[PDB]
Design an enzyme around this catalytic site. Structure first.
Site, PDB file in Angstrom:
ATOM      1  N   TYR A  50       0.855  -1.165   0.385  1.00  0.00           N
ATOM      2  CA  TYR A  50       0.314   0.372  -0.313  1.00  0.00           C
ATOM      3  C   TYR A  50       0.896   1.043   0.157  1.00  0.00           C
ATOM      4  O   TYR A  50       1.696   1.002   0.695  1.00  0.00           O
ATOM      5  CB  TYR A  50      -0.937   0.009   0.893  1.00  0.00           C
ATOM      6  N   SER A  51       0.542   2.057  -0.623  1.00  0.00           N
ATOM      7  CA  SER A  51       0.944   3.933  -0.844  1.00  0.00           C
ATOM      8  C   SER A  51       0.855   4.234   0.603  1.00  0.00           C
ATOM      9  O   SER A  51       0.143   4.822   1.101  1.00  0.00           O
ATOM     10  CB  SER A  51       0.773   4.120  -1.649  1.00  0.00           C
ATOM     11  N   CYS A  81      -1.285   7.810 -10.316  1.00  0.00           N
ATOM     12  CA  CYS A  81      -1.668   6.424  -9.454  1.00  0.00           C
ATOM     13  C   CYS A  81      -2.986   6.338  -8.982  1.00  0.00           C
ATOM     14  O   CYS A  81      -3.468   7.406  -9.706  1.00  0.00           O
ATOM     15  CB  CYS A  81      -1.099   6.859  -7.836  1.00  0.00           C
ATOM     16  N   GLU A  98       2.531   4.939 -10.842  1.00  0.00           N
ATOM     17  CA  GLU A  98       1.916   4.066 -10.229  1.00  0.00           C
ATOM     18  C   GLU A  98       0.533   2.980 -10.422  1.00  0.00           C
ATOM     19  O   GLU A  98      -0.155   4.082  -9.568  1.00  0.00           O
ATOM     20  CB  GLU A  98       2.579   3.512  -8.848  1.00  0.00           C
ATOM     21  N   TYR A 108      -1.746   0.294 -10.097  1.00  0.00           N
ATOM     22  CA  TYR A 108      -2.156  -1.793  -9.210  1.00  0.00           C
ATOM     23  C   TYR A 108      -3.729  -1.739  -9.801  1.00  0.00           C
ATOM     24  O   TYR A 108      -3.335  -3.032  -9.363  1.00  0.00           O
ATOM     25  CB  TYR A 108      -1.623  -1.191  -7.967  1.00  0.00           C
TER      26      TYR A 108
HETATM   27  C1  LIG Z   1       2.415  -0.157  -5.457  1.00  0.00           C
HETATM   28  C2  LIG Z   1       0.861  -0.891  -4.765  1.00  0.00           C
HETATM   29  C3  LIG Z   1       0.227   0.352  -4.244  1.00  0.00           C
HETATM   30  C4  LIG Z   1      -1.277   0.098  -3.642  1.00  0.00           C
HETATM   31  N1  LIG Z   1      -1.588   1.222  -2.902  1.00  0.00           N
HETATM   32  C5  LIG Z   1      -3.032   0.914  -2.633  1.00  0.00           C
HETATM   33  C6  LIG Z   1      -3.663   1.423  -1.641  1.00  0.00           C
HETATM   34  O1  LIG Z   1      -3.662   2.847  -1.197  1.00  0.00           O
HETATM   35  N2  LIG Z   1      -5.075   1.363  -1.243  1.00  0.00           N
HETATM   36  C7  LIG Z   1      -5.335  -0.301  -1.648  1.00  0.00           C
HETATM   37  O2  LIG Z   1      -6.743  -0.035  -1.527  1.00  0.00           O
HETATM   38  N3  LIG Z   1      -5.134  -1.033  -2.786  1.00  0.00           N
HETATM   39  C8  LIG Z   1      -3.434  -0.827  -2.957  1.00  0.00           C
HETATM   40  N4  LIG Z   1      -3.019  -1.445  -3.419  1.00  0.00           N
HETATM   41  C9  LIG Z   1      -3.628  -2.588  -3.811  1.00  0.00           C
HETATM   42  C10 LIG Z   1      -3.116  -3.680  -2.999  1.00  0.00           C
HETATM   43  O3  LIG Z   1      -2.146  -3.801  -2.896  1.00  0.00           O
HETATM   44  C11 LIG Z   1      -3.677  -5.477  -2.856  1.00  0.00           C
HETATM   45  O4  LIG Z   1      -3.584  -5.507  -4.405  1.00  0.00           O
HETATM   46  C12 LIG Z   1      -5.480  -4.913  -2.089  1.00  0.00           C
HETATM   47  O5  LIG Z   1      -5.726  -4.249  -1.233  1.00  0.00           O
HETATM   48  C13 LIG Z   1      -6.263  -6.740  -3.321  1.00  0.00           C
HETATM   49  O6  LIG Z   1      -6.279  -6.821  -1.557  1.00  0.00           O
HETATM   50  P1  LIG Z   1      -6.494  -7.866  -0.898  1.00  0.00           P
HETATM   51  O7  LIG Z   1      -5.209  -8.758   0.126  1.00  0.00           O
HETATM   52  O8  LIG Z   1      -7.502  -7.392   0.144  1.00  0.00           O
HETATM   53  O9  LIG Z   1      -6.868  -9.305  -1.829  1.00  0.00           O
HETATM   54  P2  LIG Z   1      -6.641 -10.778  -1.933  1.00  0.00           P
HETATM   55  O10 LIG Z   1      -6.593 -11.253  -1.096  1.00  0.00           O
HETATM   56  O11 LIG Z   1      -4.620 -10.857  -2.638  1.00  0.00           O
HETATM   57  O12 LIG Z   1      -7.069 -10.338  -3.316  1.00  0.00           O
HETATM   58  C14 LIG Z   1      -6.890 -10.677  -4.400  1.00  0.00           C
HETATM   59  C15 LIG Z   1      -6.916 -11.258  -5.549  1.00  0.00           C
HETATM   60  O13 LIG Z   1      -8.516 -11.466  -5.781  1.00  0.00           O
HETATM   61  C16 LIG Z   1      -8.419 -12.443  -7.412  1.00  0.00           C
HETATM   62  N5  LIG Z   1      -9.216 -11.176  -8.166  1.00  0.00           N
HETATM   63  C17 LIG Z   1      -9.662  -9.542  -7.631  1.00  0.00           C
HETATM   64  N6  LIG Z   1     -10.914  -9.092  -8.798  1.00  0.00           N
HETATM   65  C18 LIG Z   1     -11.185 -10.905  -9.325  1.00  0.00           C
HETATM   66  C19 LIG Z   1     -12.375 -10.164  -9.821  1.00  0.00           C
HETATM   67  N7  LIG Z   1     -13.170  -9.649 -10.127  1.00  0.00           N
HETATM   68  N8  LIG Z   1     -12.454 -11.706 -10.573  1.00  0.00           N
HETATM   69  C20 LIG Z   1     -12.199 -12.640 -10.512  1.00  0.00           C
HETATM   70  N9  LIG Z   1     -10.648 -12.801 -10.203  1.00  0.00           N
HETATM   71  C21 LIG Z   1     -10.234 -11.089  -8.933  1.00  0.00           C
HETATM   72  C22 LIG Z   1      -7.286 -12.386  -7.523  1.00  0.00           C
HETATM   73  O14 LIG Z   1      -6.751 -13.453  -7.593  1.00  0.00           O
HETATM   74  C23 LIG Z   1      -6.443 -11.239  -7.286  1.00  0.00           C
HETATM   75  O15 LIG Z   1      -5.277 -11.089  -7.007  1.00  0.00           O
HETATM   76  C24 LIG Z   1      -2.142  -0.805  -4.047  1.00  0.00           C
HETATM   77  C25 LIG Z   1      -0.853  -1.852  -5.012  1.00  0.00           C
HETATM   78  C26 LIG Z   1       0.453  -2.355  -5.087  1.00  0.00           C
HETATM   79  C27 LIG Z   1       1.253  -2.947  -6.166  1.00  0.00           C
END
Ligand SMILES: Cc1cc2nc3c(=O)[nH]c(=O)nc-3n(C[C@H](O)[C@H](O)[C@H](O)COP(=O)(O)OP(=O)(O)OC[C@H]3O[C@@H](n4cnc5c(N)ncnc54)[C@H](O)[C@@H]3O)c2cc1C
Ligand code: FES
Lengths: 98, 303
Positions: B79-80, B261, B301, B303
Protein backbone atom coordinates in the site's frame (compact mmCIF):
# COMPACT_ATOMS: atom_id res chain seq x y z
CA UNK A 1 9.82 -3.45 -32.44
CA UNK A 2 8.96 -7.07 -31.68
CA UNK A 3 11.63 -9.05 -29.85
CA UNK A 4 12.08 -12.77 -29.22
CA UNK A 5 11.51 -13.83 -25.61
CA UNK A 6 12.80 -17.35 -24.96
CA UNK A 7 11.04 -18.66 -21.85
CA UNK A 8 13.40 -20.95 -19.94
CA UNK A 9 12.37 -23.15 -17.02
CA UNK A 10 14.60 -24.62 -14.31
CA UNK A 11 12.87 -27.97 -13.83
CA UNK A 12 11.16 -29.66 -16.78
CA UNK A 13 13.91 -28.06 -18.86
CA UNK A 14 12.07 -25.58 -21.07
CA UNK A 15 13.61 -23.19 -23.59
CA UNK A 16 10.39 -22.05 -25.26
CA UNK A 17 11.16 -19.31 -27.78
CA UNK A 18 8.41 -16.73 -28.26
CA UNK A 19 7.91 -13.43 -30.08
CA UNK A 20 6.76 -10.28 -28.27
CA UNK A 21 5.75 -6.96 -29.82
CA UNK A 22 7.01 -3.71 -28.29
CA UNK A 23 3.61 -3.09 -26.71
CA UNK A 24 2.64 -6.19 -24.74
CA UNK A 25 3.63 -7.55 -21.32
CA UNK A 26 5.79 -10.68 -21.50
CA UNK A 27 2.95 -12.52 -19.76
CA UNK A 28 0.11 -12.07 -22.25
CA UNK A 29 2.36 -12.68 -25.25
CA UNK A 30 3.75 -16.17 -24.59
CA UNK A 31 0.69 -16.95 -22.48
CA UNK A 32 -1.70 -16.71 -25.43
CA UNK A 33 1.14 -18.13 -27.53
CA UNK A 34 0.55 -21.67 -26.27
CA UNK A 35 2.22 -21.31 -22.88
CA UNK A 36 0.30 -21.11 -19.61
CA UNK A 37 2.19 -18.76 -17.30
CA UNK A 38 2.03 -18.34 -13.52
CA UNK A 39 0.33 -15.15 -12.32
CA UNK A 40 -2.26 -13.63 -9.99
CA UNK A 41 -3.06 -9.92 -9.80
CA UNK A 42 -1.76 -9.19 -13.30
CA UNK A 43 -1.24 -5.62 -12.09
CA UNK A 44 2.41 -5.52 -11.05
CA UNK A 45 0.98 -5.81 -7.55
CA UNK A 46 2.28 -9.17 -6.37
CA UNK A 47 5.02 -11.76 -6.78
CA UNK A 48 3.26 -14.66 -8.48
CA UNK A 49 4.53 -13.71 -11.94
CA UNK A 50 8.06 -12.96 -10.74
CA UNK A 51 10.85 -13.57 -13.25
CA UNK A 52 14.64 -13.80 -13.15
CA UNK A 53 16.30 -12.28 -16.22
CA UNK A 54 19.19 -14.14 -17.82
CA UNK A 55 20.22 -12.15 -20.88
CA UNK A 56 18.16 -9.25 -22.21
CA UNK A 57 16.26 -6.17 -21.04
CA UNK A 58 12.73 -4.98 -20.30
CA UNK A 59 10.92 -1.85 -19.12
CA UNK A 60 9.75 -1.43 -15.53
CA UNK A 61 7.95 1.92 -15.42
CA UNK A 62 4.61 0.59 -14.18
CA UNK A 63 5.29 -1.16 -10.91
CA UNK A 64 6.10 0.34 -7.51
CA UNK A 65 5.79 -3.15 -6.07
CA UNK A 66 9.43 -3.00 -6.68
CA UNK A 67 12.53 -3.30 -4.50
CA UNK A 68 15.50 -1.42 -5.96
CA UNK A 69 17.63 -4.23 -4.53
CA UNK A 70 15.41 -6.97 -5.95
CA UNK A 71 15.24 -5.42 -9.41
CA UNK A 72 18.99 -4.85 -9.20
CA UNK A 73 19.55 -8.58 -9.70
CA UNK A 74 17.33 -8.92 -12.76
CA UNK A 75 13.93 -9.83 -11.33
CA UNK A 76 10.93 -9.09 -13.54
CA UNK A 77 7.13 -9.10 -13.38
CA UNK A 78 6.00 -10.79 -16.58
CA UNK A 79 2.50 -9.34 -16.30
CA UNK A 80 3.96 -5.86 -16.79
CA UNK A 81 7.33 -5.97 -18.56
CA UNK A 82 7.88 -4.49 -22.02
CA UNK A 83 10.80 -5.98 -23.95
CA UNK A 84 13.40 -3.23 -24.15
CA UNK A 85 15.41 -5.88 -25.98
CA UNK A 86 15.69 -9.53 -26.97
CA UNK A 87 15.05 -11.04 -23.55
CA UNK A 88 16.01 -14.43 -22.19
CA UNK A 89 14.31 -15.03 -18.84
CA UNK A 90 13.45 -17.75 -16.34
CA UNK A 91 9.90 -17.89 -15.00
CA UNK A 92 8.48 -19.40 -11.81
CA UNK A 93 10.90 -17.17 -9.91
CA UNK A 94 8.60 -16.01 -7.11
CA UNK A 95 10.15 -18.01 -4.28
CA UNK A 96 13.52 -16.32 -4.79
CA UNK A 97 11.99 -13.46 -2.80
CA UNK A 98 10.74 -13.31 0.79
CA UNK B 1 16.90 -6.33 6.63
CA UNK B 2 15.93 -5.03 10.07
CA UNK B 3 19.46 -3.76 10.64
CA UNK B 4 19.65 -3.56 6.85
CA UNK B 5 20.49 0.14 6.53
CA UNK B 6 23.77 1.42 5.08
CA UNK B 7 23.55 3.33 1.80
CA UNK B 8 21.58 6.16 0.20
CA UNK B 9 19.34 8.65 2.01
CA UNK B 10 16.00 7.21 0.91
CA UNK B 11 14.47 4.90 3.52
CA UNK B 12 13.77 1.85 1.35
CA UNK B 13 13.27 -1.58 2.88
CA UNK B 14 14.62 -1.09 6.39
CA UNK B 15 12.21 -3.89 7.28
CA UNK B 16 11.43 -7.25 5.68
CA UNK B 17 8.82 -10.02 5.90
CA UNK B 18 11.64 -12.02 7.50
CA UNK B 19 11.64 -9.32 10.18
CA UNK B 20 8.13 -7.86 10.45
CA UNK B 21 7.42 -4.74 12.50
CA UNK B 22 4.11 -5.23 14.29
CA UNK B 23 2.98 -1.60 14.17
CA UNK B 24 -0.17 -0.67 16.09
CA UNK B 25 -3.32 1.12 14.95
CA UNK B 26 -4.33 4.54 16.27
CA UNK B 27 -7.38 5.55 14.24
CA UNK B 28 -9.58 4.19 11.45
CA UNK B 29 -12.18 6.58 10.06
CA UNK B 30 -14.38 6.38 6.95
CA UNK B 31 -13.62 8.44 3.85
CA UNK B 32 -16.70 7.73 1.75
CA UNK B 33 -19.78 9.36 3.29
CA UNK B 34 -23.40 8.27 2.95
CA UNK B 35 -24.40 8.18 -0.71
CA UNK B 36 -20.90 7.10 -1.71
CA UNK B 37 -19.99 3.90 -3.54
CA UNK B 38 -18.06 1.30 -1.56
CA UNK B 39 -15.93 1.41 1.58
CA UNK B 40 -12.72 3.43 1.80
CA UNK B 41 -11.29 4.23 5.21
CA UNK B 42 -8.41 6.19 6.75
CA UNK B 43 -6.08 3.98 8.79
CA UNK B 44 -3.31 5.29 11.02
CA UNK B 45 -0.53 3.25 12.63
CA UNK B 46 1.78 4.13 15.51
CA UNK B 47 5.46 3.52 14.77
CA UNK B 48 6.81 3.32 18.32
CA UNK B 49 8.43 -0.08 18.78
CA UNK B 50 10.63 0.21 15.69
CA UNK B 51 12.79 2.48 13.55
CA UNK B 52 10.41 2.62 10.60
CA UNK B 53 11.54 5.33 8.18
CA UNK B 54 9.95 6.70 5.00
CA UNK B 55 8.99 9.76 2.98
CA UNK B 56 6.28 10.96 0.59
CA UNK B 57 5.65 8.64 -2.35
CA UNK B 58 6.97 5.37 -0.92
CA UNK B 59 4.92 2.21 -0.40
CA UNK B 60 4.37 0.35 2.87
CA UNK B 61 3.72 -3.39 3.08
CA UNK B 62 1.11 -4.82 5.43
CA UNK B 63 1.11 -8.50 6.41
CA UNK B 64 -2.24 -10.13 7.18
CA UNK B 65 -2.84 -12.56 10.03
CA UNK B 66 -3.71 -16.13 9.08
CA UNK B 67 -2.13 -19.53 8.43
CA UNK B 68 -5.20 -21.45 7.27
CA UNK B 69 -6.97 -20.43 4.08
CA UNK B 70 -4.66 -21.57 1.28
CA UNK B 71 -2.31 -23.80 3.27
CA UNK B 72 0.64 -21.41 3.21
CA UNK B 73 1.55 -18.35 5.26
CA UNK B 74 -0.27 -15.20 4.14
CA UNK B 75 1.56 -12.93 1.70
CA UNK B 76 2.47 -9.25 1.47
CA UNK B 77 -0.06 -6.75 0.17
CA UNK B 78 1.51 -3.42 -0.72
CA UNK B 79 0.00 0.00 0.00
CA UNK B 80 1.04 3.60 -0.64
CA UNK B 81 1.97 5.85 2.28
CA UNK B 82 -0.94 8.28 2.62
CA UNK B 83 1.16 10.61 4.78
CA UNK B 84 4.35 12.65 4.80
CA UNK B 85 7.52 11.14 6.26
CA UNK B 86 6.75 12.78 9.60
CA UNK B 87 3.52 10.79 9.78
CA UNK B 88 -0.06 12.04 9.91
CA UNK B 89 0.55 13.89 13.18
CA UNK B 90 3.45 16.02 11.94
CA UNK B 91 5.96 14.28 14.20
CA UNK B 92 7.84 11.12 13.23
CA UNK B 93 6.00 8.34 15.03
CA UNK B 94 2.92 7.75 12.89
CA UNK B 95 1.80 6.91 9.36
CA UNK B 96 -1.50 6.79 7.50
CA UNK B 97 -2.95 4.37 4.94
CA UNK B 98 -5.62 4.64 2.25
CA UNK B 99 -7.35 1.29 1.82
CA UNK B 100 -10.45 0.38 -0.18
CA UNK B 101 -12.43 -2.79 0.53
CA UNK B 102 -11.99 -5.28 -2.31
CA UNK B 103 -15.15 -7.20 -3.17
CA UNK B 104 -16.31 -9.01 -6.31
CA UNK B 105 -18.82 -11.65 -7.39
CA UNK B 106 -17.10 -14.97 -8.06
CA UNK B 107 -16.19 -15.55 -11.72
CA UNK B 108 -18.14 -18.81 -11.54
CA UNK B 109 -20.52 -19.01 -8.59
CA UNK B 110 -21.09 -15.26 -8.51
CA UNK B 111 -20.51 -15.16 -4.76
CA UNK B 112 -19.14 -11.83 -3.51
CA UNK B 113 -15.55 -12.26 -2.32
CA UNK B 114 -13.52 -10.16 0.11
CA UNK B 115 -9.79 -9.61 -0.35
CA UNK B 116 -8.06 -10.97 2.74
CA UNK B 117 -5.97 -7.91 3.53
CA UNK B 118 -8.04 -4.80 2.81
CA UNK B 119 -11.03 -6.55 4.35
CA UNK B 120 -8.76 -6.92 7.38
CA UNK B 121 -7.67 -3.28 7.49
CA UNK B 122 -11.01 -1.71 6.64
CA UNK B 123 -12.62 -3.31 9.69
CA UNK B 124 -9.48 -2.92 11.79
CA UNK B 125 -9.51 -2.21 15.52
CA UNK B 126 -7.57 0.55 17.29
CA UNK B 127 -4.47 -0.91 18.92
CA UNK B 128 -4.86 -4.03 16.80
CA UNK B 129 -1.33 -5.36 16.27
CA UNK B 130 -0.35 -5.02 12.62
CA UNK B 131 2.84 -6.29 10.99
CA UNK B 132 4.31 -3.60 8.74
CA UNK B 133 6.96 -4.12 6.07
CA UNK B 134 9.50 -1.35 5.45
CA UNK B 135 9.06 1.07 2.56
CA UNK B 136 9.41 -0.09 -1.05
CA UNK B 137 9.31 2.81 -3.50
CA UNK B 138 11.55 5.05 -5.59
CA UNK B 139 9.50 5.75 -8.72
CA UNK B 140 7.20 8.25 -7.00
CA UNK B 141 9.74 10.31 -5.07
CA UNK B 142 8.85 13.96 -4.47
CA UNK B 143 11.50 16.39 -5.71
CA UNK B 144 13.14 18.77 -3.24
CA UNK B 145 12.75 21.78 -5.53
CA UNK B 146 9.93 24.11 -4.47
CA UNK B 147 10.02 25.61 -7.96
CA UNK B 148 9.14 22.27 -9.54
CA UNK B 149 5.63 21.73 -10.92
CA UNK B 150 3.79 18.68 -9.59
CA UNK B 151 1.13 17.34 -11.94
CA UNK B 152 -0.99 14.71 -10.21
CA UNK B 153 -3.43 12.46 -12.06
CA UNK B 154 -5.01 10.04 -9.59
CA UNK B 155 -8.17 7.94 -9.40
CA UNK B 156 -9.84 6.44 -6.34
CA UNK B 157 -7.34 5.41 -3.66
CA UNK B 158 -4.58 6.62 -5.96
CA UNK B 159 -5.06 9.84 -3.99
CA UNK B 160 -2.63 8.43 -1.44
CA UNK B 161 0.61 9.73 -2.91
CA UNK B 162 -0.60 13.22 -3.79
CA UNK B 163 -1.81 13.65 -0.21
CA UNK B 164 1.78 13.23 0.97
CA UNK B 165 2.80 15.51 -1.88
CA UNK B 166 0.12 18.09 -1.12
CA UNK B 167 0.23 17.80 2.67
CA UNK B 168 3.96 18.48 2.98
CA UNK B 169 3.54 21.29 0.45
CA UNK B 170 0.62 23.07 2.00
CA UNK B 171 0.23 21.79 5.54
CA UNK B 172 1.01 24.60 7.98
CA UNK B 173 2.59 22.16 10.44
CA UNK B 174 4.87 20.38 7.97
CA UNK B 175 5.46 23.78 6.36
CA UNK B 176 7.14 24.65 9.66
CA UNK B 177 8.44 21.12 10.18
CA UNK B 178 10.25 21.37 6.84
CA UNK B 179 11.42 24.99 6.68
CA UNK B 180 13.87 23.99 3.95
CA UNK B 181 11.00 23.30 1.55
CA UNK B 182 8.44 26.09 1.19
CA UNK B 183 6.62 25.21 -2.03
CA UNK B 184 6.44 28.31 -4.22
CA UNK B 185 5.83 26.51 -7.52
CA UNK B 186 2.51 25.37 -8.97
CA UNK B 187 1.01 21.92 -8.41
CA UNK B 188 -2.13 20.58 -10.09
CA UNK B 189 -4.32 17.64 -9.10
CA UNK B 190 -6.87 15.95 -11.34
CA UNK B 191 -9.04 13.65 -9.24
CA UNK B 192 -11.35 11.00 -10.68
CA UNK B 193 -14.16 9.50 -8.61
CA UNK B 194 -17.69 8.14 -9.02
CA UNK B 195 -19.50 10.44 -6.59
CA UNK B 196 -19.17 13.74 -4.78
CA UNK B 197 -19.22 11.92 -1.42
CA UNK B 198 -16.58 9.59 -2.84
CA UNK B 199 -14.25 12.58 -3.06
CA UNK B 200 -11.62 11.39 -0.59
CA UNK B 201 -10.08 14.10 1.59
CA UNK B 202 -12.31 16.68 -0.08
CA UNK B 203 -12.59 19.05 2.88
CA UNK B 204 -8.81 19.40 3.15
CA UNK B 205 -7.70 19.41 -0.49
CA UNK B 206 -10.18 22.27 -0.88
CA UNK B 207 -8.87 24.04 2.20
CA UNK B 208 -5.54 23.79 0.38
CA UNK B 209 -7.33 25.40 -2.57
CA UNK B 210 -8.65 28.61 -1.02
CA UNK B 211 -5.31 29.12 0.73
CA UNK B 212 -2.99 28.60 -2.24
CA UNK B 213 -4.72 29.78 -5.41
CA UNK B 214 -1.32 30.28 -6.99
CA UNK B 215 0.33 26.98 -6.07
CA UNK B 216 -2.53 24.48 -6.30
CA UNK B 217 -5.32 23.85 -8.79
CA UNK B 218 -7.95 21.19 -8.20
CA UNK B 219 -10.05 19.38 -10.80
CA UNK B 220 -12.62 16.72 -9.92
CA UNK B 221 -13.89 14.05 -12.27
CA UNK B 222 -17.23 12.67 -11.10
CA UNK B 223 -18.57 10.25 -13.70
CA UNK B 224 -21.80 9.57 -11.83
CA UNK B 225 -22.74 13.26 -11.79
CA UNK B 226 -20.70 14.98 -14.50
CA UNK B 227 -21.02 15.01 -18.29
CA UNK B 228 -18.81 16.27 -21.11
CA UNK B 229 -20.49 18.38 -23.79
CA UNK B 230 -20.43 15.37 -26.12
CA UNK B 231 -22.79 13.70 -23.66
CA UNK B 232 -20.64 11.28 -21.67
CA UNK B 233 -20.01 10.81 -17.96
CA UNK B 234 -16.90 12.54 -16.63
CA UNK B 235 -13.82 10.35 -16.30
CA UNK B 236 -10.35 11.72 -15.57
CA UNK B 237 -9.33 10.82 -19.11
CA UNK B 238 -12.20 13.10 -20.12
CA UNK B 239 -10.96 15.87 -17.83
CA UNK B 240 -7.42 15.52 -19.16
CA UNK B 241 -8.78 15.57 -22.71
CA UNK B 242 -10.57 18.80 -21.81
CA UNK B 243 -7.36 20.33 -20.47
CA UNK B 244 -4.98 18.48 -22.79
CA UNK B 245 -3.58 21.60 -24.45
CA UNK B 246 -3.11 23.23 -21.04
CA UNK B 247 -1.58 20.14 -19.44
CA UNK B 248 0.63 19.36 -22.43
CA UNK B 249 1.88 22.95 -22.15
CA UNK B 250 2.97 22.28 -18.56
CA UNK B 251 4.99 19.10 -18.94
CA UNK B 252 6.95 20.65 -21.80
CA UNK B 253 8.46 22.84 -19.09
CA UNK B 254 11.94 22.01 -17.85
CA UNK B 255 11.38 20.80 -14.28
CA UNK B 256 7.71 19.87 -14.61
CA UNK B 257 7.06 16.39 -13.23
CA UNK B 258 3.98 14.17 -13.52
CA UNK B 259 2.54 11.66 -11.05
CA UNK B 260 -0.19 9.15 -11.88
CA UNK B 261 -1.59 6.67 -9.36
CA UNK B 262 -4.69 4.52 -8.92
CA UNK B 263 -6.22 1.35 -10.33
CA UNK B 264 -4.79 0.01 -13.59
CA UNK B 265 -6.34 1.21 -16.84
CA UNK B 266 -6.25 4.95 -16.15
CA UNK B 267 -3.12 5.59 -18.19
CA UNK B 268 -4.39 4.64 -21.64
CA UNK B 269 -7.06 7.33 -21.89
CA UNK B 270 -4.61 9.97 -20.70
CA UNK B 271 -1.81 9.07 -23.11
CA UNK B 272 -4.35 9.38 -25.93
CA UNK B 273 -5.23 12.91 -24.81
CA UNK B 274 -1.71 14.33 -24.58
CA UNK B 275 -0.95 12.46 -27.79
CA UNK B 276 -3.56 14.30 -29.85
CA UNK B 277 -2.89 17.71 -28.31
CA UNK B 278 0.86 17.16 -28.72
CA UNK B 279 0.67 15.85 -32.28
CA UNK B 280 -0.89 19.19 -33.22
CA UNK B 281 2.47 20.71 -32.35
CA UNK B 282 3.79 17.73 -34.30
CA UNK B 283 5.21 15.13 -31.92
CA UNK B 284 4.74 11.47 -31.01
CA UNK B 285 3.58 11.50 -27.39
CA UNK B 286 4.79 7.90 -27.12
CA UNK B 287 8.29 9.07 -28.05
CA UNK B 288 8.05 12.23 -25.95
CA UNK B 289 6.74 10.19 -23.02
CA UNK B 290 9.27 7.48 -23.87
CA UNK B 291 12.05 9.92 -22.98
CA UNK B 292 10.51 11.65 -19.97
CA UNK B 293 10.72 8.47 -17.90
CA UNK B 294 14.48 8.49 -18.47
CA UNK B 295 14.64 12.14 -17.41
CA UNK B 296 12.65 11.03 -14.37
CA UNK B 297 9.83 13.47 -15.07
CA UNK B 298 7.02 10.97 -15.66
CA UNK B 299 5.94 8.88 -12.68
CA UNK B 300 3.43 6.03 -12.96
CA UNK B 301 2.14 3.72 -10.24
CA UNK B 302 -1.05 1.87 -11.18
CA UNK B 303 -2.21 -1.35 -9.54
C1 LIG C 1 2.36 -0.24 -5.27
C2 LIG C 1 0.96 -0.57 -4.82
C3 LIG C 1 0.22 0.35 -4.17
C4 LIG C 1 -1.08 0.06 -3.74
N1 LIG C 1 -1.70 1.01 -2.99
C5 LIG C 1 -2.95 0.72 -2.59
C6 LIG C 1 -3.61 1.61 -1.66
O1 LIG C 1 -3.09 2.61 -1.22
N2 LIG C 1 -4.89 1.27 -1.28
C7 LIG C 1 -5.51 0.11 -1.79
O2 LIG C 1 -6.63 -0.03 -1.53
N3 LIG C 1 -4.86 -0.78 -2.52
C8 LIG C 1 -3.62 -0.50 -3.00
N4 LIG C 1 -2.97 -1.42 -3.75
C9 LIG C 1 -3.51 -2.80 -3.95
C10 LIG C 1 -3.32 -3.68 -2.69
O3 LIG C 1 -1.91 -3.81 -2.49
C11 LIG C 1 -3.91 -5.06 -2.89
O4 LIG C 1 -3.54 -5.54 -4.19
C12 LIG C 1 -5.41 -4.92 -2.88
O5 LIG C 1 -5.84 -4.15 -1.73
C13 LIG C 1 -6.04 -6.30 -2.84
O6 LIG C 1 -6.38 -6.60 -1.31
P1 LIG C 1 -6.34 -7.97 -0.71
O7 LIG C 1 -5.11 -8.37 -0.23
O8 LIG C 1 -7.40 -7.78 0.38
O9 LIG C 1 -6.72 -8.96 -1.72
P2 LIG C 1 -6.37 -10.48 -1.98
O10 LIG C 1 -6.75 -11.26 -0.99
O11 LIG C 1 -4.99 -10.60 -2.53
O12 LIG C 1 -7.17 -10.97 -3.17
C14 LIG C 1 -7.23 -10.29 -4.45
C15 LIG C 1 -7.23 -11.40 -5.53
O13 LIG C 1 -8.60 -11.64 -5.99
C16 LIG C 1 -8.51 -12.18 -7.38
N5 LIG C 1 -9.33 -11.25 -8.14
C17 LIG C 1 -9.52 -9.92 -7.83
N6 LIG C 1 -10.59 -9.41 -8.41
C18 LIG C 1 -11.13 -10.44 -9.14
C19 LIG C 1 -12.37 -10.53 -9.92
N7 LIG C 1 -13.25 -9.54 -10.06
N8 LIG C 1 -12.57 -11.75 -10.53
C20 LIG C 1 -11.70 -12.79 -10.41
N9 LIG C 1 -10.53 -12.79 -9.71
C21 LIG C 1 -10.29 -11.58 -9.09
C22 LIG C 1 -7.03 -12.18 -7.71
O14 LIG C 1 -6.48 -13.44 -7.44
C23 LIG C 1 -6.49 -11.08 -6.81
O15 LIG C 1 -5.11 -10.89 -6.72
C24 LIG C 1 -1.66 -1.13 -4.19
C25 LIG C 1 -0.95 -2.04 -4.95
C26 LIG C 1 0.39 -1.82 -5.19
C27 LIG C 1 1.13 -2.81 -6.02
S1 FES D 1 0.58 -11.38 -11.41
FE1 FES D 1 0.81 -9.97 -9.63
S2 FES D 1 2.58 -8.75 -10.23
FE2 FES D 1 2.26 -10.03 -11.97
Amino acid sequence: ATFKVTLINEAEGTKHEIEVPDDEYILDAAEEQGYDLPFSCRAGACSTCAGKLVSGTVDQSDQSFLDDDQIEAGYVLTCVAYPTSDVVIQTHKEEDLY
Amino acid sequence: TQAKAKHADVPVNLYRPNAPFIGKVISNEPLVKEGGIGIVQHIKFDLTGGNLKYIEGQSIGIIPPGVDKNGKPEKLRLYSIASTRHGDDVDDKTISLCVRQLEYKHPESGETVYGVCSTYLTHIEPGSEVKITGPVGKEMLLPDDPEANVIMLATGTGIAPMRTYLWRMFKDAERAANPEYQFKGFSWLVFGVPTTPNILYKEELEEIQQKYPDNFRLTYAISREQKNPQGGRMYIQDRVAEHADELWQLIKNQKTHTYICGLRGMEEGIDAALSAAAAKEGVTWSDYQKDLKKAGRWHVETY
